[PDB]
C-alpha cells in the first residue's frame, strides 16, 4: 500500500510461471461403467532440492468438492523426471460430474516432516472434452 514512486522490478519477471516441473496426465469418461477414468503418467523437470538433491516425488488426485480420501501414486524415490503410470478411478455418474473439479498435486515425500508441496493445478469438469481420450502436459503452478 503506498503510491509506488520507488520500486524498480521485476515485476514483471515475478509474474511468470515459476519453473515447477511439469505432469502427464490422461482422463476419458466411461460411459459405459459410468466412471472418470484418470492416468497419472509422468512427471518432468520438477525442481532440484536447494542445496543439491532430488526429491522423493508421488501424486494425489481428488474430486472438488467431494470430501472424499484422495487417491495417492506410490512415492518414487529421488528423481526429478517420475514414470508412474498408474490409473485411478472415480465412480460418479456423468450427470454428477458437472460442477466437480479434479485436481493433481505434486508432494514431496518425507518421512520426517510434513510433505512439502511441489505444485499444483486443476481441470474443471465443465471444460473437459467428454467424447475423446484427453491427455496432455500441464506445468504445475505454485501452492
Ligand atoms: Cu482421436
Ligand atoms: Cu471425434
Do not use: C
Amino acid at each position: 500500500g503506498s503510491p509506488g514512486i520507488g520500486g524498480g522490478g521485476g515485476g514483471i519477471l515475478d509474474s511468470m510461471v515459476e519453473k515447477l516441473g511439469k505432469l502427464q496426465y490422461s482422463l476419458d469418461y466411461d460411459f459405459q461403467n459410468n466412471q472418470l477414468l484418470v492416468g497419472i503418467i509422468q512427471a518432468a523437470e520438477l525442481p532440484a532440492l536447494d542445496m543439491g538433491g532430488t526429491s522423493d516425488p508421488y501424486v494425489k488426485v481428488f474430486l472438488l468438492p467431494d470430501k472424499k480420501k484422495k487417491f495417492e501414486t506410490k512415492v518414487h524415490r529421488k528423481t526429478l523426471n517420475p514414470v508412474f503410470n498408474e490409473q485411478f478411478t472415480f465412480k460418479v455418474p456423468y450427470s454428477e460430474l458437472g460442477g466437480k473439479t479434479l485436481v493433481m498435486a505434486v508432494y514431496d515425500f518425507d518421512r520426517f516432516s510434513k510433505h512439502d508441496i511441489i505444485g499444483e493445478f486443476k481441470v474443471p469438469m465443465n471444460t473437459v472434452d467428454f467424447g475423446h481420450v484427453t491427455e496432455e502436459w500441464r506445468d504445475l503452478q505454485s501452492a
